[PDB]
């Protein structure tokens, strides 16, 4: 039986102690402390001895596209750079905006900026962030020569493209250590995104296809690829930021092994609308995506606040072991 | 300037007058009244009197092309019946849903979904072979029946691909599954009959994916291309005279419809019903005015969002719009 | 075991049947159907044979202030006019805006209107509603003579004012059948509002007190009055729109009888922040405010949408019995 | 124009740099950075160098009067320690909380609150005499201890009212209870010692109300007037040089502080941390810009709202603001 007690600033600002005190502070601070424990359990299992080498715990990291628009892009890049996770799942924006950020920056704005004035100035709004139209022109100039080569390799070298194979290629092409997908392909970390056409990359494929028709992106082979990552794992953990396709696709892969061993959700969705996004971890227990003997954790919060704190208290403390 | 005033039950109970009074009641009731107005504006344009090679589609053009999107769980709910009615009577032109929203319409033709409670514990449900969807329950046997029904169809699809040159995409598969289920309770039966295409770019994310996966180890070779389906949905928008978007929930379904309409520099009419909030920067939670900034909604449109569970609001919306104009659609 | 099935509009628009189909539609539509059943159980008990006459079920109706700004003001007035509920609990805005609406209307606006331009034009925003400053000037001119008389009656006739006694007096003074509190005092329905100073009525008492000091509003006697309404009831029901003080004050009164027999919440709050507003009915079971054998219902929705539908399917169908 | 960029853990773990990077991370992380800026602006003004009969208060004026409001459940949480620290060191000037936020600070001096889970079932908890507050647990015996401690104090308050002319209000009672608990872990012990008034107009809505209720049948006569407490809080705003509002959660606490500041035609600085959303028309969920329309926030202020559980955000906020300036407050 653990008593509720917050951090006492009469001790001064001891940041490690302040973060540890979230566990006994209550409400979502306590869930944060539980999430730290669950992620550290994943890492401790992964470091147990037994293209990418198998480890004792396969960690799936999922995130919605807007988190790549945000500075959480740097947090994810760090984990991928140091081989701390094994499989990435994101929607199409979460692919393309990592690449675009290597060509031009995203800027801070406000949620309340009016769409008319923004559109008239060629500025696209993402929450309280701003992406100029010119960023996508740069993307077009960068991407079209690659699409030309991909069609050629398909038609003359027999290549059968899927979203994950295209994402590996785009990461190699961007050739920039600030990029998540640069590090992912270098470290043989696959990236799944079954609706890769739903964004700017789709715009480009669409326009490209009228001049150079025929590109195929098969989602069936990529379903086999993600499901086998779960089926042949010794143990699995899921770390899922946000909801939607990213959350369900990781969960359903883990259903194929009768459930993940560890799971942490950070998302703002609520259960009352019946949505998969808002479903509690215990819903996933009913269908076998989380094992009955797991102790999963959900933190109800904007991941832009919580995820850097979580990484500080887990992966970043064990960096030595990942090098 | 319109005064706030609620329905007066000293009039008795006239349900049409009750629903009309939402407009002057305030908060999301007022947004509901605005949504009724926007959908009726879409319908009135669609009925104005007024291609096939450009869209690579057999569906005849009308004066307003309406895109209807909905998340998968709304097909688990009774909103499945609401959507089926609109598709049955050719009241909308394009559907977008995620994979669950396809498969559970078909499964409901084989076995029912049941009422439960949100608080039922996962361990006991799992031990009893019952899967929870919010406060709904789907027995494992429903998926066994689905497997028995679907596996021969997947055999035929592979055979047609390898010897008749068929290049499958999600929308082409969904049309075939609707034809095979051959049941007037099914949304996708009516969609294929009425030449209403269904887009679902992540069609592998669900039970149909499970089945395709297992089937492929018995019968390898099925391919599902998402590139041609992007061409097909975008051309529905580009060659429209006018467009409206009616979007229930968020995620891929909402963005995919919005991005198609960006290709024509924006939708003319738009109604969102969803529970998501903007503060997390999500596309699901973004206000319609965010979409104006990137060109998916025209600057001169008057879009409407209702912040509510669509299981409550969507049947009322249909009652006051499409269902009132049924004669014009017959 | 009940199957999920929505209303089939191939039947045409049969509104009663459409509303009944919410019960088998799922998610919050099913909770709406459950709420109809729970309220009808309250009413059926109330109509069982055994200043205000006691009945077989005492119904407490609570609502946040903004719902009186809204057109739900008419819905509440109707229930109170016909003696369909027994105790009202609202915050201070929910008192004063009913009275002000008898002097001048509230108007429809938009949530996005900018505060600076509104303030410069003397327009106050309440959500997507608008109240001109002039409405409060009218209120001042109307109320100040009443405050003069209340101070006189306190100092010369021994009156000990409480919020509920002031609300009865204000209802008698407004003398207008459009007003909730006019009907409440006429029908001997008490109104509790322990923080009655938190709003425009407070502004007025404050300004009045410098010219005519001494008015006392005791909250202790009003605590005895609301608690005795629960303690001596045969059965109780709670119908609570929104959260905050209104929700807890009704619940805590019912804890004094070891719990309400029936309970329906309609509110938009979520549990994750630990708030009383967002707590599920089952939290209230732990502390004894809802009986262990009750079957309470929460609908997660804006009450401006749901409450008129709920009344249509419950109280309004039994109007004959209330006359 | 500032670029989006998150903290780079290739630097290692420097927690101050990590928190500073929230400003350029986006979404509510960016709002957190803006909140740090606004609170530090309040503090810097308060420390500028620079009545008693007008405010009927013994507290000396500073260059910025800071109002701190918080909902009751945050005193059930460990944020009680965070608030106590600010009050102990005279860093804020006025407190507003609901009744639970008073009584549970006192009860925690008698017995602890424990960690639990949101999903614990009410029937089993009730049968075991345990009350649930979110994912926290308070045994019934805590309230028994509270009763034993409080009843003699209520006896003295009635006696002082009837023979020494005392006219009790919530704030006067809260000062007395803080003096009686005589324990440096208590928020209200420090508030009365430092002449920080606490307003709680619905002080009867909770366990203190229960106790006053039962006590009154043994010892009739206690009166609690809310009119004088309205005069007292409003005069704190009217006679301020500058004001800031720091408001955790919504409800009465948020409006009561805002309405006091309306009396001076608006607060100069304002930070909200709350989880409520605007769509339901609620005051809790209203954006700061709503308060600009009615005059509670000055038109030239730059208020900030962070959409988050304060149990997560408030300790971080204090770490980067008040706790950095501790020396100036000593
Ligand atoms: N930057 C963009 O948002 C962007 C860009 C291009 C395309 N798109 C497309 O939009 C579609 C829908 O986007 P999506 O599925 O990535 O998610 P989404 O933005 O729709 O969010 C889904 C849910 O995830 C949760 N979530 C979102 N942001 C969160 C946060 N900061 N913290 C915690 N939880 C959070 C919320 O509950 C939200 O409702 C995708 O197909 C995507 O490619 C979006
Ligand atoms: N029945 C199921 O939920 C189910 C079944 C199989 C697979 N999946 C998979 O889960 C993935 C994610 O599901 P999704 O993208 O369809 O949506 P989702 O369930 O993740 O919902 C996305 C957002 O839509 C909004 N929404 C959901 N239900 C709503 C309602 N009742 N009223 C209003 N707004 C509502 C909410 O803001 C929610 O966060 C999909 O790829 C899907 O195939 C789900
Ligand atoms: N019109 C006004 O809002 C107004 C006017 C004058 C004074 N005030 C003062 O503001 C203070 C706080 O207001 P309050 O306690 O009445 O509530 P509130 O507006 O703070 O709402 C409390 C909670 O109730 C729920 N709620 C609100 N509106 C809802 C709706 N439409 N449907 C469902 N749930 C809903 C929400 O979860 C919300 O967070 C009170 O003391 C009041 O006197 C407000
Ligand atoms: N511990 C308790 O909760 C408790 C104890 C005794 C009595 N009560 C009574 O309940 C009544 C209502 O409680 P209240 O008005 O203090 O608030 P509440 O708990 O009703 O919360 C009001 C709103 O504040 C916001 N909020 C709450 N917790 C938050 C958090 N962790 N982070 C951010 N925002 C948050 C939310 O939007 C919430 O809807 C009061 O009269 C009180 O005395 C409660």
Residue numbers in the entry:
A (entry chain B), C (entry chain B): 28 to 77, 91 to 363
B (entry chain A), D (entry chain A): 28 to 77, 84 to 363
Quote the authors verbatim.
Hypusination is a unique post-translational modification of the eukaryotic translation factor 5A (eIF5A) that is essential for overcoming ribosome stalling at polyproline sequence stretches. The initial step of hypusination, the formation of deoxyhypusine, is catalyzed by deoxyhypusine synthase (DHS), however, the molecular details of the DHS-mediated reaction remained elusive. DHS catalyzes the transfer of the 4-aminobutyl moiety from SPD to the modifiable lysine (Lys50) of eIF5A in a NAD-dependent manner. Recently, patient-derived variants of DHS and eIF5A have been linked to rare neurodevelopmental disorders.
Interestingly, we observed that the indole ring of Trp327 is shifted perpendicularly in the complex, relative to its position in DHSwt. Simultaneously, within DHS, the rearranged position of Trp327 would collide with Lys329, which was mutated to alanine in the trapped complex used in our structural studies. It was therefore plausible that this conformational change was a direct or indirect result of the K329A mutation, rather than eIF5A binding per se. To address this issue, we determined the crystal structure of DHSK329A in complex with NAD and SPD and refined it at 1.6 Å. DHSK329A crystallized in the P3221 space group with one tightly associated DHS dimer per asymmetric unit. The DHS tetramer, which constitutes the active form of the enzyme, is completed by the neighboring crystallographic symmetry mate. In the structure of DHSK329A-NAD-SPD, we observed two alternative conformations of the Trp327 side chain with almost equivalent occupancies. In detail, we found the perpendicular position that is also found in the eIF5A-DHS complex and the position that is parallel to the bound SPD molecule, as in DHSwt (without protein ligand). The observed conformational change indicates that the K329A mutation gives rise to greater conformational freedom of the bulky indole chain of Trp327.
